[PDB]
Amino acid sequence: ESQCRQNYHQESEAGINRQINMELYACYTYQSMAYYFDRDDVALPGFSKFFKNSSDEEREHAEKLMKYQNKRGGRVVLQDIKKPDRDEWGTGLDAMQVALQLEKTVNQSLLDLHKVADSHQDAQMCDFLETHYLEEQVNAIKEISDHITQLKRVGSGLGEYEYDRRLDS
Amino acid sequence: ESQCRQNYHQESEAGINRQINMELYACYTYQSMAYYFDRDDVALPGFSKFFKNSSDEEREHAEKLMKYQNKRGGRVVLQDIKKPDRDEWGTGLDAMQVALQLEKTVNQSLLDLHKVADSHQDAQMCDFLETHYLEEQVNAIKEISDHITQLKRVGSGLGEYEYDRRLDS
Amino acid sequence: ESQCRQNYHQESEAGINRQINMELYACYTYQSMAYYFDRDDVALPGFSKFFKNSSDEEREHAEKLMKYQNKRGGRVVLQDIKKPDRDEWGTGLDAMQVALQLEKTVNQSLLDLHKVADSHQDAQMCDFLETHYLEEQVNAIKEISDHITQLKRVGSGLGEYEYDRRLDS
Amino acid sequence: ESQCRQNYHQESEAGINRQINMELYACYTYQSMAYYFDRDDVALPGFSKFFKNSSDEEREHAEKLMKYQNKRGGRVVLQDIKKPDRDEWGTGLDAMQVALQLEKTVNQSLLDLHKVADSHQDAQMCDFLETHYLEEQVNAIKEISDHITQLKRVGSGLGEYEYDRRLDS
Ligand SMILES: [Mg+2]
Ligand SMILES: [Mg+2]
Ligand SMILES: [Mg+2]
Ligand SMILES: [Mg+2]
Numbered sequence: 001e002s003q004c005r006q007n008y009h010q011e012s013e014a015g016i017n018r019q020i021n022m023e024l025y026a027c028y029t030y031q032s033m034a035y036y037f038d039r040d041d042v043a044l045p046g047f048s049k050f051f052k053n054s055s056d057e058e059r060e061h062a063e064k065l066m067k068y069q070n071k072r073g074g075r076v077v078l079q080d081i082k083k084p085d086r087d088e089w090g091t092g093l094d095a096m097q098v099a100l101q102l103e104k105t106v107n108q109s110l111l112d113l114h115k116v117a118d119s120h121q122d123a124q125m126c127d128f129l130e131t132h133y134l135e136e137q138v139n140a141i142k143e144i145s146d147h148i149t150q151l152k153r154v155g156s157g158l159g160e161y162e163y164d165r166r167l168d169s
Numbered sequence: 170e171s172q173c174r175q176n177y178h179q180e181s182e183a184g185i186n187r188q189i190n191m192e193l194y195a196c197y198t199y200q201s202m203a204y205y206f207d208r209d210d211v212a213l214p215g216f217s218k219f220f221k222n223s224s225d226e227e228r229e230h231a232e233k234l235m236k237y238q239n240k241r242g243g244r245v246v247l248q249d250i251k252k253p254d255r256d257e258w259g260t261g262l263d264a265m266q267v268a269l270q271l272e273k274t275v276n277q278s279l280l281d282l283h284k285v286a287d288s289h290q291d292a293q294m295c296d297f298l299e300t301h302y303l304e305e306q307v308n309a310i311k312e313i314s315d316h317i318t319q320l321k322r323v324g325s326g327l328g329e330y331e332y333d334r335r336l337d338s
Numbered sequence: 339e340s341q342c343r344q345n346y347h348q349e350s351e352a353g354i355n356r357q358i359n360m361e362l363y364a365c366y367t368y369q370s371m372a373y374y375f376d377r378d379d380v381a382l383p384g385f386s387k388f389f390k391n392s393s394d395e396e397r398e399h400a401e402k403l404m405k406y407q408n409k410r411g412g413r414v415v416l417q418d419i420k421k422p423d424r425d426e427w428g429t430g431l432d433a434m435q436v437a438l439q440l441e442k443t444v445n446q447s448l449l450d451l452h453k454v455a456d457s458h459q460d461a462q463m464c465d466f467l468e469t470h471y472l473e474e475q476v477n478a479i480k481e482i483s484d485h486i487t488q489l490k491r492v493g494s495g496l497g498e499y500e501y502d503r504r505l506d507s
Numbered sequence: 508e509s510q511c512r513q514n515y516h517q518e519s520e521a522g523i524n525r526q527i528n529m530e531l532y533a534c535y536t537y538q539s540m541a542y543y544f545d546r547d548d549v550a551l552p553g554f555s556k557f558f559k560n561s562s563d564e565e566r567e568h569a570e571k572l573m574k575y576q577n578k579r580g581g582r583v584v585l586q587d588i589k590k591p592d593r594d595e596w597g598t599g600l601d602a603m604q605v606a607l608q609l610e611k612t613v614n615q616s617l618l619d620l621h622k623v624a625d626s627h628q629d630a631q632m633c634d635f636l637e638t639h640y641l642e643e644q645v646n647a648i649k650e651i652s653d654h655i656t657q658l659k660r661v662g663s664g665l666g667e668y669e670y671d672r673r674l675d676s
Binding site for chain 3: 077
């Protein structure tokens with residue numbers, strides 16, 4: 001047992017490892033979207049930039065959990081990063097819709113993880129998740145939802161082009 | 170009853186006073202370590218600096234709880250500050266090992282205090298402890314644990330000298 | 339067929355996708371090493387920094403190939419990122435030794451890929467690999483080899499500590 | 508024979524002269540497009556700017572080959588610059604489509620020229636073409652392909668106007 005470990009349940013430790021893989025899964029999916037929008041037959045560089053940035057942030061989310069695992073004296077155990085669900089992601093609206101459901105899946109996983117920590121009276125881990133993950137997901141879900149609504153507003157063709165400009169600017 | 174007081178249980182108030190004395194106890198122990206390493210027959214000025222800084226921070230932890238007691242309308246009641254457990258603290262590794270167990274004792278006390286506040290639905294006090302005390306203890310326990318591991322790595326003699334340089338720099 | 343595509347053989351396109359997954363595999367392995375050295379019972383922050391930086395660079399190598407695939411009109415096809423070969427990586431010397439063999443495996447893969455492009459007279463892809471991948475691997479293999487030799491020179495304990503300082507500085 | 512000349516085959520020298528005329532042919536065609544889009548009944552100043560810049564760059568490509576011919580001790584032999592294939596170039600999309608096929612024709616010519624140099628083991632000329640011509644063509648073909656895809660996305664009328672703004676900005 002780690003000389004660090006205190007009030008840290010084995011279930012919370014395993015849930016951290018589960019969340020780490022989920023953050024990496026999201027990172028990989030956003031990276032796929034980024035280079036899908038970089039295809040010559042898609043050519044939406046603002047959408048590409050938005051999902052590239054989303055992918056970098058998910059990588060940061062994963063590493064912060066890796067750091068936290070070690071802080072508490074748990075042990076990082078990594079698993080395969082599953083390839084994304086699709087190879088092509090359709091229109092800008094299609095990809096934002098996928099991104100919304102992905103962010104909500106990550107949020108549900110974090111809420112489940114918070115329930116685990118709370119069930120073991122892990123007050124510090126609960127605050128860590130609230131501060132560094134739960135607030136971010138609410139903001140990210142609202143932001144993408146706004147993108148979806150705007151993308152439906154502007155429609156296909158020129159509208160998608162104009163919104164890509166917004167994401168590039 | 171204080172014109173301030175609201176949702177503040179007498180047990181939470183008494184637990185704050187208990188934590189105050191514990192923070193002061195840690196302050197005094199680190200101060201002892203600081204001037205132990207300043208002995209001419211010990212002569213480890215980086216270890217001295219590290220524990221001097223640790224002592225100043227524990228004094229700050231105590232005062233912030235004193236401030237918080239008044240914010241909530243509780244009343245600060247001070248007790249004797251017990252002299253440290255030892256007069257001499259051995260090697261740099263020995264003192265870090267003591268520091269780890271002290272920090273874990275402070276952390277257990279804070280976790281107990283958090284359970285008291287939570288049992289009385291004192292949501293604000295719980296957040297105060299999480300934000301200003303529980304995160305710090307996890308970081309401090311990890312930092313000292315890293316020091317212990319490095320101090321075992323470098324060994325006695327020149328190794329202890331070199332790590333003292335690191336702490337001085 | 340992509341409106342871009344010219345002098346780009348399907349085998350070269352598939353080899354790019356193979357190299358992409360290999361770069362991501364190396365990225366993941368270095369990330370594992372980074373947080374292994376961040377364990378409280380390992381506590382080698384310079385080694386951690388070196389492999390964190392190595393992981394970021396491998397991620398960049400992957401994305402540049404993703405970009406190149408699209409430039410030529412090929413289509414990025416991603417596969418699972420296999421978890422690293424180990425969960426723990428031993429001493430600093432052990433991890434550098436693993437890193438050397440990983441870099442040589444990546445280099446062999448790139449040399450094979452270069453042979454594929456050259457067999458199809460893909461002069462531009464050959465230059466792209468030479469400029470952005472083959473030179474880097476020779477430099478990276480020499481750098482890690484120097485680390486291994488120095489790590490054997492300094493030995494275990496204090497020596498490993500001192501070399502960690504070098505990597506942190 | 509030039510006092511410079513070394514490992515420079517007469518076929519490579521003649522191929523350089525062929526490429527020079529082709530670069531000048533592209534320069535002239537882009538210049539035509541530039542002033543077509545400057546017509547009062549076309550009035551697309553961003554498209555005009557894009558093709559003006561393309562024309563200047565093709566002129567630079569030609570001169571660098573002229574310089575290279577002399578460096579190797581070959582002799583520049585110029586031929587008529589054939590007038591462009593059309594006098595009017597249609598919509599912005601039409602002109603980008605022509606530009607794509609022109610760039611691919613230049614790229615095929617360069618690949619053929621590279622095969623000539625490589626067949627005579629002219630390693631330096633091969634590197635010169637790879638470094639200064641083959642990479643540029645891949646980037647230029649991808650860029651124009653992205654323009655075509657975006658121009659189809661935005662459609663005629665206002666869409667063409669908006670993309671002209673992008674090219675002007
Ligand atoms: Mg995330
Ligand atoms: Mg304290
Ligand atoms: Mg690489
Ligand atoms: Mg040219």
